Amino acid sequence: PLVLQESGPGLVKPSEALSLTCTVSGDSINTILYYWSWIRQPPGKGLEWIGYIYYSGSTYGNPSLKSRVTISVNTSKNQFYSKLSSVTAADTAVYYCARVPLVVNPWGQGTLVTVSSASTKGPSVFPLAPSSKSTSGGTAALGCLVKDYFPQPVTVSWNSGALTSGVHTFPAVLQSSGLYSLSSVVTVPSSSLGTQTYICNVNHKPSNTKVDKRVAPELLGGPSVFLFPPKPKDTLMISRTPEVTCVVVDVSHEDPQVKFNWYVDGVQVHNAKTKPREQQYNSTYRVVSVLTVLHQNWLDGKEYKCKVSNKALPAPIEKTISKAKGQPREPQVYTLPPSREEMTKNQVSLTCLVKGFYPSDIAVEWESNGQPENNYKTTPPVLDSDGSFFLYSKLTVDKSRWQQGNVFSCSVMHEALHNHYTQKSLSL
Amino acid sequence: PLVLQESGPGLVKPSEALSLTCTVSGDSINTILYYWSWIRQPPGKGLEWIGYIYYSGSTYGNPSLKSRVTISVNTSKNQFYSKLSSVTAADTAVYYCARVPLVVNPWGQGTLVTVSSASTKGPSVFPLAPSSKSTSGGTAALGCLVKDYFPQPVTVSWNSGALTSGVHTFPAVLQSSGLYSLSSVVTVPSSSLGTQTYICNVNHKPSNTKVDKRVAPELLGGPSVFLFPPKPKDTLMISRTPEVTCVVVDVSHEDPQVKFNWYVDGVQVHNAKTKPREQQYNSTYRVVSVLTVLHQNWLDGKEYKCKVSNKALPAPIEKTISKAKGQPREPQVYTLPPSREEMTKNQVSLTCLVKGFYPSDIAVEWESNGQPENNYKTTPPVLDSDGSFFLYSKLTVDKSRWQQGNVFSCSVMHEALHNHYTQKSLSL
Amino acid sequence: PSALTQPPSASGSLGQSVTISCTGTSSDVGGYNYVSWYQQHAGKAPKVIIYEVNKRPSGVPDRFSGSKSGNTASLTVSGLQAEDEADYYCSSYEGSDNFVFGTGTKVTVLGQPKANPTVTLFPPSSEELQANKATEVCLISDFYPGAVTVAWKADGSPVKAGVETTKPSKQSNNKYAASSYLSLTPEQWKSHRSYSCQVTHEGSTVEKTVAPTECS
Amino acid sequence: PSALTQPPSASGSLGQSVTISCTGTSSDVGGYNYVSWYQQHAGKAPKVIIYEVNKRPSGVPDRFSGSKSGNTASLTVSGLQAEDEADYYCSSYEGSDNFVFGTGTKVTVLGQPKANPTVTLFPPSSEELQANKATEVCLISDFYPGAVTVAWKADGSPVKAGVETTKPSKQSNNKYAASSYLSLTPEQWKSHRSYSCQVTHEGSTVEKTVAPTECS
């Protein structure tokens, strides 16, 4: 790698002498191969060429600085020379050691030719710390930046000075006050953020200030709860065991810890044999918390609750296993056959009304004969006109199979009915 | 109110003299009306009576302290007297000024008779700060408590010393070290917590330590999101305006601030005419954020997203308006009449199959004739066998109205069909 | 002098009749019919339930039937409740003014389990923070043995100086309670984010805090 | 001495042919056929696109057709892209070694809007916190006027001392940038929970922070 770096600086006042210079390490030339240039930029203006030199034998200087300039070299020592004699009021510029290729493209650091004495005092620091709001693709850019110095070059080093992959040490400023401010970004993977420690670590030897600082990103998660029935055969059977259950889902993997509170009645049961379990679901968990119920308490009009408290939830999601108020009702279970215009179709379908019911504690089904059937859709009921509930059940079969004389039985397992089940039955 | 409070204390060593006393303010007696007692409790034992006196004229002292004791009074000055002469090794007890009713029930403060010199040094403090986990009814109890002192009485005052409603200054201890620790609870309304500032504010004048501290409770809230279709007549019409919408619900009232991010494609649209609105729903809000769509972009296979970020959500709920993959399908729209066994019923019902479809971008309906009908339930479809979707639609009417010859029309507005609508039609 | 000799304990089931006694000394139970049964609840001083051999005032119910036969005076609390777990004792006069009072009977409804309340954590006050001091403390209230320990943390690790932890004894509900404190200056509290406190008590050992973190 | 006289600006629509020029001085454009067109992107030094009157190297495409007629040398960037917004300029030799270089042409694709990047907030280092000091700062980077302001807060309220805010000038993308700092000792940072900083810049005024609170 090539470097070009200048010396001789200070601030001085017109009618006496200053000698500037530039040394190079990592590419050959000085004068021998190509040429060299020196530029100047006044504070508020841009770039103007001040001289040229060749292989060794032709130095031509600018009509401002003509007859005046001397742009010389020291080939064997690889160093450059700018000894001049009368830099007046306006000549105070940003002089930089400009190697040539085919025109003037390798940039030095340069050293300032300025006019009457001067000071040297302090920097400090700034870390561009990244916005969660996403830019496109696998791009993420965070940073560092350094503020308010006097003398320039600095040593802005990333993660003590290592990780110069996706780094753009963004360029400096020389303020209207006379001060300084630059940046230094880290343009690496978005996933590799949070997963790793990144540190901005500066140093300034013109005064004495050194520094160090980090990173983090963000995205989706915040859970859901639900509460569930005991089976009605578990509750009606004196010998089989009922239970109320509290599923908490969407938990997370960065906030597991799901605590429960259990109120059988208003008075805390606390315990009974409430049993949770946290198991590795898709990229979160499924937690199944489990109360034990003695039949009667359900049947003697009891109120239940599960106040789920996880840290990912600022405020604990309560849920009452609450039944509803009432009308009687026992479903108006009448299955129905097709519109005749489906015997002009390879595939028929079958209905099963279950209207007129209160609670919405429904469990319809279908069959072919002793074994079940696979193709069905069941409506999860609408609160009716005369203050009841109703639904419709499907069985998507074949006309060919229908006229073979198949015995489809819409098994229903809803409530103020006889065997906590009633089955209406259908065929042609 | 009555007070009884004792003096004369210290620690001294057997074979010389101590004179204890008790003065009262807020009830009459001393000797004249009733009687007075003095007790003693050794460190590790309980209560034993040491003497008695009447109206004025009969002082009887204990067989331990008989012939020994003198329990006397000063009626006019309202003060009591215990001048005694030989409290040996075991006599060092918790002596307290015990007024009598019918037996020995108003408790003084008492002053300790102890044995050989003693010190006096420091307390400090403890605030019972309440558990969110609920106790039954409109009960809530928080507190304060004071620790590690030498000399006793203290001034534990609640909310600079005011709010002596539901306060139980819970009783003290005299430790095995010789030290002290008591409590002071605030048993007021549960709702009035968070809503108000409560302060525990102690003071001890035996040494010099004073103090002050507060309270808070907890319960439910943490939001939900959803994303919604443009109307297909808005998208198919070059002249009518389509749009994708992001409803965020369950927001809260303690965390309003819902920010959105909008990616039409992967590249942020940022803006378009995305318009939110926060309006006072039930005890939270409903926020309706609103993108503007030029038809074509939907139709030219575009991906959409709404990354909803509220503070009540640690991690931002993203949702992609994503369509699905494909099979063709255009619903197998065949409405069906009853099972004949419903003309033995005052009320009939009607079916409407819509099977065989891909997307689940369904919009079925019903009618009576030109005007709609009120009683219907529609299944939100099941992913079929041959890789399709299917549902069932109801219309709960009367047999009487059916045999009058009513023209029920199951209007469907699902998709790979002709008028982005097809209607199958049914009657008897 | 005389202690009125009471049965030491007596037990009854819920829905049973519990009897208690009291054997005198002439000048008291036997002398007069002025025998006085009381009911004390562990926290305060005794209430009045029976005096003068079945002579009761107001508030107290029909259930309490107490009298005297021989010089064994009796109290019968029939059809008992969960309310009646208290310290019941006999009393009586002596003449002129004085009276003798009983040695106690503990009435039980049949069968018994365990119970627990609080160990908090607290900072200084601004009354001391003013003229250089930060005295913190650690409270271990209520238990039944007289044997508890304490120890602290300061950013999670073992501390070793300036903490005075001292031994437990009895309250007005006759359970023992404990004391501790550690003393630093403003600066050392200001440098420290945490102070966690760890008590123990017979295998029930604790690293405590109600605290949901410390922050702002 | 001589500046090669270029058209000052030139504009084209996307899908149009843009031409640029360069009027010499004998010893350069007119002398030799060695006329050199360049393309500079505001952040770094110039790249090579054309030299020797339509003689180009590698990487650069078919689109760039540049040559010379009379002493007005020309560059034509046909069928332009959004990539081509850059500082294009002519050059040429003089003899022996020297060369004269152009005064620039700004090529535009037709029509233009506004843009904004960053103002952060930072504490001290532990390199100074060690031997008593807490020097904080406030950075107002990049804008186009040379007129910005700054002011701070410390727990939300107006501060008045020890802050050195000083005036903005040009960068390598030729936009101005600013500086500020305030100096306290460990103790005064340690007492203070917040330090918020407020810049302004021509009606675009700021009370900033990326910070999601301050805590632990």
Ligand SMILES: *[C@@H]1O[C@H](CO[C@H]2O[C@@H](C)[C@@H](O)[C@@H](O)[C@@H]2O)[C@@H](O[C@@H]2O[C@H](CO)[C@@H](O[C@@H]3O[C@H](CO[C@H]4O[C@H](CO)[C@@H](O)[C@H](O)[C@@H]4O[C@@H]4O[C@H](CO)[C@@H](O[C@@H]5O[C@H](CO)[C@H](O)[C@H](O[C@]6(C(=O)O)C[C@H](O)[C@@H](NC(C)=O)[C@H]([C@H](O)[C@H](O)CO)O6)[C@H]5O)[C@H](O)[C@H]4NC(C)=O)[C@@H](O)[C@H](O[C@H]4O[C@@H](CO)[C@@H](O)[C@H](O)[C@@H]4O[C@@H]4O[C@H](CO)[C@@H](O)[C@H](O)[C@H]4NC(C)=O)[C@@H]3O)[C@H](O)[C@H]2NC(C)=O)[C@H](O)[C@H]1NC(C)=O
């Ligand atoms: C993740 O994940 C996913 C995906 O992935 C997956 O995949 C697969 C394939 C695989 O792979 C795996 O792994 C993976 O993972 C997803 O997630 C998701 O998400 C979503 C959204 O986002 C959500 O949602 C939620 O959820 C819910 C649910 O529910 C249910 O259902 C389903 C279907 O069916 C299922 O599955 C689930 O789970 C559930 O279930 C349930 O559960 C429970 C528990 O777990 C159960 O129970 C039970 O039972 C019985 C009783 O009852 C039995 O018994 C048992 O056991 C016991 C008891 O019980 O207890 C034990 C004991 O101990 C005993 N005992 C004695 C006595 O002894 C016994 C035994 O038995 C012995 O043996 C005797 O001897 O027992 C139990 O366990 C139950 O059953 C079940 N259920 C049924 C039904 O069946 C849903 O639903 C929801 O919603 C809601 O929302 C919320 C919010 O935010 C709120 O607001 C509310 O809740 C709502 O709602 C409403 O409500 C009302 C009232 O309130 C009602 O009624 C209505 O209707 C409603 N409505 C509506 C409309 O809704 C939520 O949303 C979730 O989270 C998840 N999941 C799912 C499934 O979905 C995601 O994305 C992923 N990702 C990541 C990245 O991460």
Ligand SMILES: *[C@@H]1O[C@H](CO[C@H]2O[C@@H](C)[C@@H](O)[C@@H](O)[C@@H]2O)[C@@H](O[C@@H]2O[C@H](CO)[C@@H](O[C@@H]3O[C@H](CO[C@H]4O[C@H](CO)[C@@H](O)[C@H](O)[C@@H]4O[C@@H]4O[C@H](CO)[C@@H](O[C@@H]5O[C@H](CO)[C@H](O)[C@H](O[C@]6(C(=O)O)C[C@H](O)[C@@H](NC(C)=O)[C@H]([C@H](O)[C@H](O)CO)O6)[C@H]5O)[C@H](O)[C@H]4NC(C)=O)[C@@H](O)[C@H](O[C@H]4O[C@@H](CO)[C@@H](O)[C@H](O)[C@@H]4O[C@@H]4O[C@H](CO)[C@@H](O)[C@H](O)[C@H]4NC(C)=O)[C@@H]3O)[C@H](O)[C@H]2NC(C)=O)[C@H](O)[C@H]1NC(C)=O
């Ligand atoms: C509170 O509240 C409540 C109670 O209360 C109440 O009551 C009442 C009576 C009254 O009083 C009131 O006030 C109150 O408040 C409650 O709350 C609740 O909660 C729950 C639970 O917890 C929840 O849930 C959630 O949600 C959701 C919902 O959704 C829907 O639906 C419903 C029914 O229908 C409704 O209502 C709602 O809202 C919704 O709706 C929607 O919305 C939207 C917005 O807002 C709309 O849109 C629209 O449209 C169109 C378009 O498209 C139009 O257009 C408009 O406008 C516009 C636009 O658009 O844009 C504007 C613009 O600008 C323009 N443009 C242009 C171009 O120009 C235009 C215009 O038009 C012009 O004119 C032209 O010219 O436009 C818009 O706006 C839509 O439409 C609607 N929709 C419909 C459908 O229709 C549910 O759903 C959910 O769930 C889910 O879950 C989650 C979680 O956590 C997740 O995971 C997910 O999402 C799930 O799911 C799933 O998913 C999938 C996909 O992904 C699907 O597909 C499936 O299916 C599913 N599944 C399932 C199963 O689900 C959630 O959960 C909530 O939150 C609430 N709400 C409700 C309703 O529910 C509570 O509790 C209370 N409390 C307290 C204490 O606070």
